[PDB]
Amino acid sequence: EIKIADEVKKSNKEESKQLLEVLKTKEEHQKEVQYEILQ
Amino acid sequence: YPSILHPIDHAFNEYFLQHQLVEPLNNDIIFNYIPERIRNDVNYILNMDRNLPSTARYIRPNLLQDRLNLHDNFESLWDTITTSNYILARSVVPDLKELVSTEAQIQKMSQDLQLEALTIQSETQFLTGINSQAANDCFKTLIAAMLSQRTMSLDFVTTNYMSLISGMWLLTVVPNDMFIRESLVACQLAIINTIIYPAFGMQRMHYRNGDPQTPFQIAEQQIQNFQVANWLHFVNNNQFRQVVIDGVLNQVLNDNIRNGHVVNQLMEALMQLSRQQFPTMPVDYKRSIQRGILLLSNRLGQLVDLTRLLAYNYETLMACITMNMQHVQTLTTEKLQLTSVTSLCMLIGNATVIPSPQTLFHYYNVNVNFHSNYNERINDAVAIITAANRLNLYQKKMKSIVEDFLKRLQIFDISRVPDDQMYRLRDRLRLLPVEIRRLDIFNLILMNMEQIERASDKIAQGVIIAYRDMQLERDEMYGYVNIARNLDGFQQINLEELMRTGDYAQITNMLLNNQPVALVGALPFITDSSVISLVAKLDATV
Amino acid sequence: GVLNQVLNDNIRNGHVVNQLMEALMQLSRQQFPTMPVDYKRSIQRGILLLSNRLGQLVDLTRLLAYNYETLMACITMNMQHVQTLTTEKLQLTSVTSLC
Amino acid sequence: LVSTEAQIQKMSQDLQLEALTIQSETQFLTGINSQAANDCFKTLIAAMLS
Amino acid sequence: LVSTEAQIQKMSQDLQLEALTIQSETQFLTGINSQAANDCFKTLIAAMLS
Numbered sequence: 019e020i021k022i023a024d025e026v027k028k029s030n031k032e033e034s035k036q037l038l039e040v041l042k043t044k045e046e047h048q049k050e051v052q053y054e055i056l057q
Numbered sequence: 058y059p060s061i062l063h064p065i066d067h068a069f070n071e072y073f074l075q076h077q078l079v080e081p082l083n084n085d086i087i088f089n090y091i092p093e094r095i096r097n098d099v100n101y102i103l104n105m106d107r108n109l110p111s112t113a114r115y116i117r118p119n120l121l122q123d124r125l126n127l128h129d130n131f132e133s134l135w136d137t138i139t140t141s142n143y144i145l146a147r148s149v150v151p152d153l154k155e156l157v158s159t160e161a162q163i164q165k166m167s168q169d170l171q172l173e174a175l176t177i178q179s180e181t182q183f184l185t186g187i188n189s190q191a192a193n194d195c196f197k198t199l200i201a202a203m204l205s206q207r208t209m210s211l212d213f214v215t216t217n218y219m220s221l222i223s224g225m226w227l228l229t230v231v232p233n234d235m236f237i238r239e240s241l242v243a244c245q246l247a248i249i250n251t252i253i254y255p256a257f258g259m260q261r262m263h264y265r266n267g268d269p270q271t272p273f274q275i276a277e278q279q280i281q282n283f284q285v286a287n288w289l290h291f292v293n294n295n296q297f298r299q300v301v302i303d304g305v306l307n308q309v310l311n312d313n314i315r316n317g318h319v320v321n322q323l324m325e326a327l328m329q330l331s332r333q334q335f336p337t338m339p340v341d342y343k344r345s346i347q348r349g350i351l352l353l354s355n356r357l358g359q360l361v362d363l364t365r366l367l368a369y370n371y372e373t374l375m376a377c378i379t380m381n382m383q384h385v386q387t388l389t390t391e392k393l394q395l396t397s398v399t400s401l402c403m404l405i406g407n408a409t410v411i412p413s414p415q416t417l418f419h420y421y422n423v424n425v426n427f428h429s430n431y432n433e434r435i436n437d438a439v440a441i442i443t444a445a446n447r448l449n450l451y452q453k454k455m456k457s458i459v460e461d462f463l464k465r466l467q468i469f470d471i472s473r474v475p476d477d478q479m480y481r482l483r484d485r486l487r488l489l490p491v492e493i494r495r496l497d498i499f500n501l502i503l504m505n506m507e508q509i510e511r512a513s514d515k516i517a518q519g520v521i522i523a524y525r526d527m528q529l530e531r532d533e534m535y536g537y538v539n540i541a542r543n544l545d546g547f548q549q550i551n552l553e554e555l556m557r558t559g560d561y562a563q564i565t566n567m568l569l570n571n572q573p574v575a576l577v578g579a580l581p582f583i584t585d586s587s588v589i590s591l592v593a594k595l596d597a598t599v
Numbered sequence: 600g601v602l603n604q605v606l607n608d609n610i611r612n613g614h615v616v617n618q619l620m621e622a623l624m625q626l627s628r629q630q631f632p633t634m635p636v637d638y639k640r641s642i643q644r645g646i647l648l649l650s651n652r653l654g655q656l657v658d659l660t661r662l663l664a665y666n667y668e669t670l671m672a673c674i675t676m677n678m679q680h681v682q683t684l685t686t687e688k689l690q691l692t693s694v695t696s697l698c
Numbered sequence: 699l700v701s702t703e704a705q706i707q708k709m710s711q712d713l714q715l716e717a718l719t720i721q722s723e724t725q726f727l728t729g730i731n732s733q734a735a736n737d738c739f740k741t742l743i744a745a746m747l748s
Numbered sequence: 749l750v751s752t753e754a755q756i757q758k759m760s761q762d763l764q765l766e767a768l769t770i771q772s773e774t775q776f777l778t779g780i781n782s783q784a785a786n787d788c789f790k791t792l793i794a795a796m797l798s
Contacts, residue, residue: 648712
């Protein structure tokens with residue numbers, strides 16, 4: 019569940035998918051550090 | 058035409074004939090009925106297909122400004138009116154056209170920002186709220202608010218520095234007096250702390266909450282740079298110019314905003330920030346800021362033209378206003394997301410959008426109808442009020458009348474209004490004069506009401522008592538009658554005074570001792586037609 | 600022949616409340632120099648509420664005084680002032696309701 | 699008397715407490731009802747008469 | 749107070765944290781929870797009183 023427009027999610031351009039992968043990685047890093055702190 | 062009439066009837070009919078409201082009509086009056094500015098606007102062309110005769114007529118409205126001053130201590134009703142006009146204005150602002158695609162812009166933004174995946178950055182949040190439907194939301198919010206003169210707040214976050222940057226454009230092309238204080242104080246404070254003072258090594262800031270001076274004021278007189286100080290000077294001293302035009306007050310922009318030149322000083326300022334190392338703070342902070350403001354530098358020309366477009370549509374829609382557009386802070390605000398401001402500032406280009414003349418005529422007719430109805434209902438209320446006062450109606454509570462005045466203004470809910478506002482509003486309405494039609498009709502009633510009350514052979518205007526064997530009059534529609542038509546000599550007692558404060562001591566003393574007296578007030582009576590009732594003195598048994 | 604604790608005759612007629620609302624309009628119009636604004640505004644507007652209840656509070660004061668004196672007339676014993684031990688409570692919410 | 703609710707809406711929207719960050723949100727507009735105003739009206743007069 | 753994770757995002761972003769680097773900025777985020785702050789706030793005053 020990402021906070022970005024429909025036409026970027028469904029965009030079959032490469033830069034859009036690269037962006038989405040980057041952002042997912044950002045999210046998961048943040049979650050890793052939060053989970054650590056809570057541990 | 059011939060007619061048969063009583064003189065009162067003739068008075069009223071003749072007044073109806075002479076003082077009827079119609080005016081000859083022709084195409085010149087069709088033009089001149091349109092506002093000046095729109096005819097004088099070269100972008101609009103106007104024709105027609107008819108030639109109206111001298112036979113034609115038209116009725117004119119009453120576009121007289123507010124006699125009641127609802128912009129003073131009736132702030133709830135003013136909030137209502139202001140909201141109503143705001144959400145009307147939203148309905149007529151154009152929808153933007155040929156916007157930039159969201160992905161086409163997000164890709165440029167992302168490659169300009171070099172978004173590393175592994176490491177954490179403040180720079181991802183700049184992509185927050187870049188859709189369309191926010192660009193139009195801001196474009197439709199700002200103008201509608203400036204037209205309605207409805208204040209609006211700023212909801213935002215202290216980590217999306219792009220919001221703080223776009224706030225600069227905002228606070229240029231929109232006066233600080235248009236917002237509510239605490240919100241833009243927070244915005245200015247964020248901006249000062251995180252773009253400006255670190256860009257000159259100044260202290261972070263020490264801002265007191267209820268400080269009278271907003272942060273951009275005492276920032277104007279700490280830093281040492283001409284560009285930024287001039288920018289701040291414009292911001293702090295930007296405010297609407299009041300000016301009365303074609304009968305209506307107008308809140309006009311600087312005319313340095315109507316052309317886009319403010320944006321050039323804003324660019325000067327942002328560039329003189331880009332050329333500053335941040336000695337206090339690390340490389341990545343500076344990197345973030347300078348990227349964030351390159352994103353707006355590269356949109357400079359679009360911003361210039363956007364500002365021009367906003368000002369243009371604002372004045373163009375302003376031309377279609379009839380009620381004076383007072384500037385007072387409202388109770389309730391409109392939310393404004395700075396993410397939408399970012400979206401507008403970023404997604405815009407090569408597409409002018411102008412209000413169709415149909416939207417303009419609609420936004421004019423709506424306000425005209427509301428304004429005429431406001432004035433006419435005021436006249437109604439003032440008429441009945443002045444008439445109840447001049448008719449000495451002292452038991453009448455003037456509250457239902459204000460309900461009838463507000464129900465007819467079809468935007469207010471009276472089920473949840475107080476009952477003291479009605480009497481304050483009454484206190485204002487008493488001061489207003491009456492129009493001519495109603496006043497003249499009333500004055501025709503006043504000089505003739507007594508003569509009407511003489512008729513209606515059901516009540517009589519008083520009864521005399523005089524213990525003396527007086528004579529009956531030789532009237533010819535009757536025969537002999539116990540009638541009087543002067544009431545002179547024998548003194549008189551009013552009955553409403555006696556029915557208010559029961560003091561029957563006077564009348565009782567006068568009746569028991571058989572003193573002559575008259576009794577004055579509408580009283581019934583029976584027609585007795587027997588001489589045997591006369592000889593026996595029965596009219597003294599009552 | 601009976602003692603009586605009477606009022607001022609600038610209260611029995613409601614005229615002093617005009618002075619009150621003058622003071623309250625002034626307090627409305629002021630800057631609260633050190634104060635926050637979201638709280639300043641609410642205070643000013645809550646003041647304006649009673650400043651709009653002017654005539655109604657004149658009416659209240661006059662009615663109150665009238666009923667008090669009419670009932671005072673129906674007293675036979677001297678009515679004297681002493682600080683009593685126990686004390687009737689009065690909730691200012693109730694005075695707010697009345698005003 | 700005036701509609702209580704008509705004063706409650708108005709006071710709520712004029713004071714605008716939800717905008718604030720204080721802890722008297724419901725507690726301001728308590729006792730505003732009738733059966734409080736008549737109580738005070740009686741209490742003042744009785745206490746001055748006694 | 750300010751929320752804790754709300755503060756951890758701001759701290760992470762002001763302390764730009766690389767996923768694959770054993771650097772000392774991570775330890776800055778340790779023990780930042782609420783109710784440690786109440787513990788200190790009570791401890792200090794209670795000691796300076798006692």
